[PDB]
Amino acid sequence: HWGYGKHNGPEHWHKDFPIAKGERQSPVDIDTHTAKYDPSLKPLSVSYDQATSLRILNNGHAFNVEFDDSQDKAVLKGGPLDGTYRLIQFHFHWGSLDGQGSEHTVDKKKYAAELHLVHWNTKYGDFGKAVQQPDGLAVLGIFLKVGSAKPGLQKVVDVLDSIKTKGKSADFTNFDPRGLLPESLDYWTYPGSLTTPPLLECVTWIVLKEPISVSSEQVLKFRKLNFNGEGEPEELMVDNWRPAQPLKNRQIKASFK
Ligand SMILES: NS(=O)(=O)c1ccc(NC(=O)Cc2ccccc2)cc1
Numbered sequence: 463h464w465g466y467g468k469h470n471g472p473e474h475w476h477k478d479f480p481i482a483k484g485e486r487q488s489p490v491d492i493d494t495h496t497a498k499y500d501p502s503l504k505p506l507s508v509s510y511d512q513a514t515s516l517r518i519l520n521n522g523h524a525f526n527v528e529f530d531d532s533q534d535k536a537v538l539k540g541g542p543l544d545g546t547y548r549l550i551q552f553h554f555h556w557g558s559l560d561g562q563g564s565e566h567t568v569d570k571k572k573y574a575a576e577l578h579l580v581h582w583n584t585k586y587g588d589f590g591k592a593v594q595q596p597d598g599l600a601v602l603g604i605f606l607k608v609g610s611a612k613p614g615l616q617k618v619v620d621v622l623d624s625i626k627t628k629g630k631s632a633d634f635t636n637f638d639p640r641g642l643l644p645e646s647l648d649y650w651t652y653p654g655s656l657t658t659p660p661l662l663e664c665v666t667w668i669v670l671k672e673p674i675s676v677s678s679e680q681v682l683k684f685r686k687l688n689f690n691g692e693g694e695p696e697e698l699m700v701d702n703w704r705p706a707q708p709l710k711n712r713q714i715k716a717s718f719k
Pocket residue numbers: 578580589590593601655656657658659660
């Protein structure tokens with residue numbers, strides 16, 4: 463099965479998922495000097511006040527904090543988007559070292575980690591239908607650098623002991639994802655894909671310019687998770703990122719000058 467190792471990692475994915483070599487794959491390098499300001503972009507609207515988190519799951523590739531997406535409770539709108547996109551889960555990608563771990567890069571710079579807040583377009587009724595549409599998903603990407611702690615991340619860090627291995631879940635209610643956002647909502651946007659198999663070309667990417675800072679102790683706790691199941695040989699869940707893919711016939715737009 464696919465993963466992030468030498469024998470099943472990103473260079474192999476195309477054999478089971480030929481769209482890996484498609485026309486709108488993610489992540490990409492964001493060349494800041496080549497992105498163009500688009501004055502018609504609207505400000506983002508992040509409306510997370512009624513968010514209902516339910517559960518945290520180690521799925522063997524990352525950990526997901528899942529939300530109740532059966533009503534408009536935590537939604538993303540505006541920016542490049544038409545319509546209302548409901549938050550279904552967030553997760554991270556991270557490195558074995560502070561010098562790598564993000565999926566997107568900025569002028570070839572890699573961050574220590576990257577947060578993905580995954581949303582789907584309510585016009586398609588459910589997530590499984592949305593991933594089959596070119597405008598089905600909107601993923602809000604936020605870079606993490608190592609420095610000061612992010613207080614709003616700590617509740618996530620402290621539950622990780624309970625979901626160390628693949629297939630473990632834990633109750634995770636009343637978590638407020640607003641505590642994971644930076645001050646500014648300035649962003650870059652482009653059309654792309656899921657960054658893991660099945661690599662579907664269904665995502666409007668919205669990547670914030672301002673990173674959040676997390677502490678060394680916080681990211682070290684991410685690196686204690688396991689890709690394996692309980693009772694299987696231990697392999698640390700680190701370097702669960704896909705490298706930058708060719709931009710091809712796309713322009714990255716910026717919301718700011
Ligand atoms: N790293 S990312 O945010 O691009 C990203 C976000 C989500 C997924 N996968 C699913 O959510 C699972 C699924 C896929 C297809 C159909 C039903 C379920 C992979 C990558």
